[PDB]
Every structure is written in structure tokens, then in C-alpha cells.
Amino acid sequence: GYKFGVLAKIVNYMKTRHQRGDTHPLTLDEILDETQHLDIGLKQKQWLMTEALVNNPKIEVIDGKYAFKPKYNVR
Amino acid sequence: TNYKPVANHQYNIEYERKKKEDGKRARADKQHVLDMLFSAFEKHQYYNLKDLVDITKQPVVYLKEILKEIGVQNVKGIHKNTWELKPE
Amino acid sequence: TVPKLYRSVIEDVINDVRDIFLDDGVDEQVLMELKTLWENKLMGQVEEEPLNSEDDVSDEEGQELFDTENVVVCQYDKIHRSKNKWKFHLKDGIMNLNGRDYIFSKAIGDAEW
Amino acid sequence: MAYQLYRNTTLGNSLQESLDELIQSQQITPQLALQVLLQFDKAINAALAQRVRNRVNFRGSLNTYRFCDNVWTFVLNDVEFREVTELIKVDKVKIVACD
Amino acid sequence: SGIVPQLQNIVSTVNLGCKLDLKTIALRARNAEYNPKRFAAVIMRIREPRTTALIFSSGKMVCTGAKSEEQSRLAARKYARVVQKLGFPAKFLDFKIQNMVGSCDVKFPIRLEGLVLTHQQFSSYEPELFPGLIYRMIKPRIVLLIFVSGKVVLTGAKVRAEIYEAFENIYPILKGFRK
Amino acid sequence: QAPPRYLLKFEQIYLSKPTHWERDGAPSPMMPNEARLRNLTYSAPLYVDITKTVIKEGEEQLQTQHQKTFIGKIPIMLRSTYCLLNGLTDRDLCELNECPLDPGGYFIINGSEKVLIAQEKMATNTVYVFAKKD
Amino acid sequence: LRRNEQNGAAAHVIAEDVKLLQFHVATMVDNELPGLPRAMQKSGRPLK
Amino acid sequence: LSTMIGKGTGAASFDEFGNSKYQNRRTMSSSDRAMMNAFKEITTMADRINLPRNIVDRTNNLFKQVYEQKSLKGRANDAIASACLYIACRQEGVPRTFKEICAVSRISKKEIGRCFKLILKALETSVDLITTGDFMSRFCSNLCLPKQVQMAATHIARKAVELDLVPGRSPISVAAAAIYMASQASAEKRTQKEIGDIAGVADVTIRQSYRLIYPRAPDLFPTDFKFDTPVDKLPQL
Amino acid sequence: RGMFKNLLKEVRIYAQKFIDRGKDFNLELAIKTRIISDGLKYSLATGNWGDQARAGVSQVLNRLTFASTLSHLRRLNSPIGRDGKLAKPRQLHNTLWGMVCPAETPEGHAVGLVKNLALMAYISVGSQPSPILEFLEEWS
Helix, strand or coil, rough: CCCCHHHHHHHHHHHHHCCCCCCCCCCCHHHHHHHHCCCCCCHHHHHHHHHHHHHCEEEECCCCEEECCCCCCCC | CCCCCCCCHHHHHHHHHHHHHHCCCCCCCCCHHHHHHHHHHHHHCCCHHHHCEEEEEEEEHHHHHHHHHHHCCEEECCCCCCCCCCCC | HHHHHHHHHHHHHHHCCCCHHHHHHCCCCCHHHHHHHHHHHHHCCCCCHHHHHHCCCCCCEEEEEHHHEEEEEEEEEEEEEEEEEEEEEEEEEEEEEECEEEECEEEEEECCC | CCCCCCCCCCHHHHHHHHHHHHHCCCCHHHHHHHHHHHHHHHHHHHHHHHCCCEEEEEEEEEEEEEECCCEEEEEEEEEECCCCCCCEEEEEEEEEEEC | CCCEEEEEEEEEEEEECCCCCCCHHHCCCCCCCCCCCCCCCEEEECCCCCCCEEEECCEEEECCCCCHHHHHHHHHHHHHHHHHCCCCCCCCCCEEEEEEEEEECCCCEECCCHHHHHHHEEEECCCCCCCEEEECCCCCCEEECCCCCCCCCEECCCCCCHHHHHHHHHHHHHHHHHH | CCCCCEEEEEEEEEECEEECCCCCCEEECCCCHHHHCCCCEEEEEEEEEEEEEEECCCCCEEEEEEEEEEEEECCCCCCCCCCCCCCCHHHHHHHCCCCCCCCHHHHEEEEEEECCEEECCCCCCCCCCCCCCC | HHHHHHHCCCCCHHHHHHHHHHHHHHHEEEEEECCCEEEEECCCCCCC | CEEEECCCCCCCHHCCEECCCCCCCCCHHHHHHHHHHHHHEEEEHHEEEEEHHHHHEEEHHHHHHHHHCCCCCCCHHHHHHHHHHHHHHHHCCCCCCHHHHHHCCCHHHHHHHHHHHHHHHHCCCCCCCCCCCEEEEEEHHHHCHHHHHHHHHHHHHHHHHHCCCCCCCCCHHHHHHHHHHHHHHCCCCCCCHHHHHCCCCCCCCCHHHHHHHCCCCHHHHHCCCCCCCCHHHCCCC | CCCHHHHHHHHHHHHHCCCCCCCCCCCCCCCCCCCCHHHHHHCCCCEEECCCCCCEEECCCCCHHHHHHHHHHHHCCCCCCCCCCCCCCCCCCCCCCCCCCCCCCCCCCCCCCCECCCCCCCCCCCCCCHHHHHHHHHHC
């Protein structure tokens, strides 16, 4: 399979990263370092930027960088 | 001649030998079982619970607890309430 | 016999790596140089928490560590044990007995303890 | 990504040393050497499965056996290999069995 | 009576009180056997007491194959030491002997078809299922394995005194039905 | 189906003499007089021959055959060729406590003599023209 | 029918129970209906 | 006291998508479904070996008594029913072999044996011990042997039990040995294969039984048996 | 016809139930000896023909006189309803000569409908039409 399986691993990584207290946002390549997805496709990269991280109600953008949404959820 | 007394039927001892050679589905770690969970999800969008036990080869109660954390249920009135493998 | 089986292994290895070498652009000149080097290298205690009252309850652990003696690397079909003996249904496998290489397809093993 | 059982033999060690000479000479990448060992393991597994049609018998006394992840670790002492064409005497034999 | 049985297995539960990793033990044990498709535990045997052990992820330790209560406790202490050697906090919590089995002889053949007739509400003789007589009596909670050869196996007690009291009641019964 | 495939081919029918099974399970030939007395049914076992062929991949088409499979009992008309009283002399009929003058032609069900009245139907396969004045 | 009303069932299922209660009331009074089926009890005999 | 709805008779009984408006829905408890499916299995089980209806009625009495007392929670309904058929056969004075019942039911000998043990323990019902004479009429008529051969077989079997010559052997193994002597010492000869097939007794076990009952043969036979074959002419098996 | 069809239907679902889940099946215990046995013993006893099609076909033999036994074994029964006031199938038709008795007939509601064979009447047993059709196509 391709293009439909790596998104679950990415959203699981940054959610667990937010559980450790990482409030500061992270870039796309920084997340891809520890998820063992360095051979990911370029057409996947543009699809993540324009669809995946803007339709998800758990992702918010600060100066072009993506992070979790703790304000929407109850804390 | 027919209905001859036997200690055990031929089809029953063939099934018992197959069941004792194959054994029970083994309990596995959470990180590995998710990999064939995502690998199967990449092939087809929808799946029945009755078919995942024949793919990843895991205990039904274990598979039903692990997938409940990330997956959800959407009601379908056409055939059966089918489980969803999508985390969202 | 055994050298004839070894040359049949040589023909199978060099045939199976032709598609691998041409997949990543590796030239053919690597293969026969590898085979030449491959041939040359071959030819009343009421306080029960401490358990230090006993010692020397284990044998030498080095038998796994040395591996100097003969090592049998084979495959099994069925292994059963009853009252005294371990019996084995071993399919095809290989070993190294005193340098000489032996081969087998079926074997029945009996051991005691 | 295979059984990886014939690698710990004299044949496996000679091939591994041969690939080490090519790696130290900067001729091939270590990824190719892993692919060579992977294809060699598949080649030797098919060679013993097809062209071997002989049977041997052996007896001995066991001292150490272990089992995990479908791997056996039989160790036999005072082993007498009884074959129809030759008899082999040896003090100790270790058996590694997989499936 | 003058005849006393001798024990042949003893099973007992004790709690280590800590969780255990099965895979870590199985790679690093003297006598490890771990096939998850067959069973949920690792068996391990040692040669001097001839006992067998069943270690579990729950920390419950159960053993079998001993010949004495002191032998069974010392075998459990040896088994706890092996677990504790690999970095686990093995302890001894709630040691209790659960079942022992004993075998003995009477040295005369026994008429079974007359014994099942007089104790019909206590025994059941089914030579199609098993050639021995099952005798399920109440006072020491012991099942008996009575055979025409005279061998009797005493089974199911919590102490050795129950087996000794068991054969004291049954020996006059077996004496009256001697062939 | 559900892959293995099975075919159950049926074959020659075997029908025996009318037999009675007691409480012991011992078969015995049923007398027509005993059926009338003990309220039995005068029935004969019906045995079928079945050849079972398994179809599976791997060139392993095995043909097994079961001889004379019991598939129930059929009530038997008295004094027919398949009854017990077929081809018996008058002396042998009297020894069996059965009347020689009895014409037969009737079943024995639960000990009652049951006769099948010949039902009359309109003849089939034939074109008919009627005169419906309505 | 009373249980489905107090449990709030669907409209099609409560319509079938009313239609079946319609049949059972009428069959109690008249079991010689012109087109409707006739009630039977395990043996094929019409119910009087 | 539910009724049933008959077939439609006119246009008012059919909906416009080609189907009846009134459907024969019928209520029945899941417990009654289990009892009905077990009773429908018992009549199937009993009529395969041609049991009379009174054994079926005693089996259904035994099944209903156990099922309402409810001690057998986890064992299969076919296994417990097949065990109740075994007990009701034995309680009427004509018991059957476990292999005979296992040949009809889907349920193995080990499973019905465990069900037979658990029913007797959980019903407080005492049942008599079998003998060799109870397995005589069935095992002799199936092999097509005459009445005098039957009388000789049931005499040497009863004599061997009373004299206590073979402790601990199952009554099946001495019944088939009694058939083997009565057939080999008469005109109607029957080999060990045909006798063992009816008895389920292995062609090993019947020799194992025959190697000790042999050398006292003329004492077992009755004094008024027409010996078609002499005792000393029997084969040395 | 239908009783063997009913037996073959049930042995199909029984074998399908044991092969859907993979036990295979033993055929000798798949077939019950209960469908043919009950179906042919409930019929010929109750007089019902089905399993509402026909009724009153099998009767208890009138064992009162040897003349009565012979007359009952050779009886013809008409399917015309006895509550019908029509008289067209009750009259003695001209073609009943020699194979239906013109004299013997019961009285009352059944008159003319229950008939009896003559002395020499022989009802045809049936035969295959293949030899006749083979002869005709062989001919001109």
C-alpha cells in the first residue's frame, strides 16, 4: 500500500509528542525524522500540506508550522 | 454392515489433528499487530471483524480491544454494523 | 557426490543473483571475482527472602559461547517426548562433522537424560 | 528478512569474510552484501530441499536443550553417527533446529 | 493395617508478587520452553529434584513432580532463585500445598463387580471408559483408583494425613471383598 | 462448495425383507401375523448405494463408496413379490398363522389393515373440448 | 404493540403490528374471510 | 398458545410487491428451541439404531430432568443428549456400547464418557452394572448365527464371568470371545474381522482375550451342545 | 417424489453446515431414516396426502365378509365433491361395460361416485414409451 498508511503514523507521533509537553510546533521534516519515513513521496508531501493538516480539527498552524490543538479540547 | 461402531469418527480426528497442529492464535505485542492493521487498511477501505482474524492471525478479544482505541463504528443498515480501521 | 552437490549450489547461486545485480546497475565483473575468492577461502530457615544458602546448582555456560565442536543446522517436522526419550522427525538439513560436510533428507534421533 | 540459519556455518562465514573484503575495498555497498546473503540463504534452502534424497541415523546423550521463537538448541554428548556406509564418532554435537 | 501409601507427585501454589516477562526469561533460561500457540507459560525442569515448574506473567508459581513436602518447598525455592537470578523480585507469598497423589498395593486381587454393587451411590465402575474403579468418598475428599491387580492410587488430598486416614477406612472394605 | 468440491452420486436401490427390531436391537423377520397382533408396521428397510467423489486441487480426486446406506423403511403390500409371503405354498402359509385364502393387496400400518382405494383423475396429456354454457 | 409504543419503535414496524392486530381481532370474530388467510394451529385445520 | 397463519387465498391477502401482507411470525423461547432441537436430535439418534419409542421417551425424560436442574452449563446439547440416550438404554435392561452410540452421534467417545460421568454425579441416579449376557442377542443376530449357537455363546460367557477367569477385561472383549468360540465350533464360521467390526473390538484385543479363555474350553460349553467341530480341533489362537 | 426431495434437501443443508466451518462430514450419519419412514407411515394411515391435496384415500379394510374384503380391495373413488348437486358424473355411462360393475354402488350421498371393478377388469400398470417411439421412427 501507499499514500494511505503513513498519515496514521504521523498523527500518532505528534499526539504522543504533545503528551510529553511539546507545546512548540514542529516542521514536516522534523516529524519525518523519527517516524522512519525519509523515503516518503514528494506528491505525498504536497498532499499533506494542502489537505491533511488543514481539514483535521486537531491541527493548528503557527507561522507555517503545525502543532496540536489544546485550546479546542478540554484541559 | 453400516453404522459400524467406531471409537471416533474419521472427520473428527482429522479436525482434531489439524487444530492441535495449528494451535491457538498467539498473543502478540501492540506495535507489531498495528503494522498488519495498517497494511490491511491500505488495501481495502472497509473490513469485517470476521476477516481480520484470518489475516493478522490474532485472538478476537485482543483484536477487539486494540482496534477500539483508534477505530470507531459506523452504522450500516444495508448488511451489518461494520467496523472502521480509520483513526479519524 | 558432495562436491557435485556443491557445484550444483554454485550454479544455483550465480543464476539467482543475475536479476539482483542488473536491478541496481552492478556490473557482471563483480560476480566471477566473488566466486574465485569464494573457492579460494574454502579450498530451619524461617526468613525466606535470601536464597544464598545453595550454590553450584548450574553447569558450565560456555558450551553456547565456544561453538568449536560440530554444529547441526537442520529443520524439524515433529518432535515428541514420552517418559525417557526425545524423538525427532527431521527434514533436510546440513552439518559439519570434523570438517567433512555431510547431508541428509530424513533422520530419526534418540536421546536420553 | 528470512530464516537466517545457514549464516552461522563455515560456508556462511567464508561468504561473510568475502563480502567484508569487498566492503573494505569500497567496491560494493553493505546493502548489496545483505542482499547477496539474502539470496544465498534462499538458494541454499532450495538446494537442500530438492536435490537431497539420503537418510542418516544418529544416537547420543543430551545435556542442554532450549526453545524459543521456533528455534531449538539441542546439545548432545557422546554422539555416535550410524550410517550404512560410514560410522562417525564425536564427543559433543550441538543441534540448532528451526521451522 | 500395617500398609501405608507413599507419595508420587505434590502440587502447590505460591505467589512471587511481581509481574514477569516471558520473552526475557525464554531467551535467557537453562531449560526454557515457550511456544505461545500451545500454552500461555514457560516450563522448566531441573534434574536433582526431578520436579517441573509453571511460571506465569501473573507471578503465580505452581510446581509438580516432587516426592515430599520439604522436597517440594525446596524445589520451589530453587525455582524462585532462577527467576530472581534474571533480575526479577521473586518472593514467597501464600505458600500452600494444593494436591498430592500416592500409589500403594494390597497384594491381593479385588472383586470390583461386588464392590460397585454395595457402594453404588459412592463408586462408578465403567470398564468401557477406564479399566479401573473410581471411588469418590466424602470424608477426606479422595478419589480412588481400584484395579483387579490390587494396586490403589490415592488422589486429591490437602495433607498427608488425609491419605493415611483414607486407606485406614478402605482397607477393611477391601479385606471383606478379597477374591 | 466452501475450494473443495463434493459430489454425492446416488446408485442402485437395495430393498430387503420386512424385518422387526426388538428392544435388544436384534433384527428378526416380521411376520404378517405379528404386525397385526403387536400393532407393528409391516415395513422393509430401504438401502441406497452412494458413491462420494471429492474434487480438490492437487490431482487428488478420491472416489469413496458406501455400500447399502440405510435411508428409512417403506411399507410393504402383503402378497406382493417383495413381501415375505411371496411364493409360499398353502401348507407354509398355515404354518405362519396366515390365511391362504387372504388375497392380500393391503398394507399393515400400526396393526390396522389399510387399503389404498384407486383414486380416479381426469386423463392427462390429452386435449379436451367442453361445452360450458355459462 | 404496547411495548413498541412505549419503547418508541419505527413507523413501519408499528404499522405491521397494527395490521397484524387487525387480522387477529377480525379472525376471532370471522374466520371465513373472502380473501384473507384463515388461522390454523400446527395441523392445517381452520380455526373455528 | 400461539397459532399459525395459513396461505393466502385471494388478492386481499397479497401486497403489491408479490408477497403476502400477513406473515407467519411465531414466538418460541430460546430454551424451548434448545429442547425441540435436542428432541429432534434424539429421535434421529434413536431411529438410526432402531430403538423403540419407549427408550426415546425415557431419554427425553432424562434430558428434560437434567436441563431444568441445569448442572451441565458448558457441554454441547448434542453431547448431553447422546449421553442421556446411553443411560436410558441401560436403564431399560438393554445397554449399548459407547462405540455403538458414538457411531450414530457426531460426539466422540471421550466426550460422551465425560458427559455420562457428570450426569450420574449431578442427578443422584444409580444405574446397574452391565454383564456379558445383556450383549448377547444383539451381537449374535447381527452376525447371522443360529439360536443354538446363541445359547452356546451366552453359556460360555456367563460361565467365564462366574468362574472369574479373566479379571478386569471389558464385557465386550469376553462377549466377542464367546461369539468366536460359538462360531468356530459350529457350521457358521465367522472370522475375527467380521466379529470385531460389529463389536468395535480391535483385531488385537480379541486375540488378547482369546489367549487366556482358550485352554479351559470344554468346561465352559454346555453338556447338551451338538459339537459340529471338536474342541481339540479349534485353532491355536 | 417429494419425500426423497425433502431428504436430499436436508442432507444438503446438513453437509453445508459442516463444510462452511471445515469439519467435512460423515455421510452415513448425515441422512436420517426418519423422513421416508414417517412420511410413508403417517400417510396410508391418516389418509392425508402431502408433506390438503387429497383426503380419505387410505381406508381400514372392511374385514366383515370375504365378499366385503374383495369388494373393498377393488374399489374406485371419484374426486367429485359430495356437496355438489350436479348429476352428470353420477349416472351409469355407456362406456362402463365390462370393467366397472353396473350393479354394485353404495346408497345415499355417495351413489354413483364410488364404483367397483368388474371381474375381468385389469388396470394398466404402465410402461416406457421408448420402445414404441423407437419402432415408429425406425418405420416409415
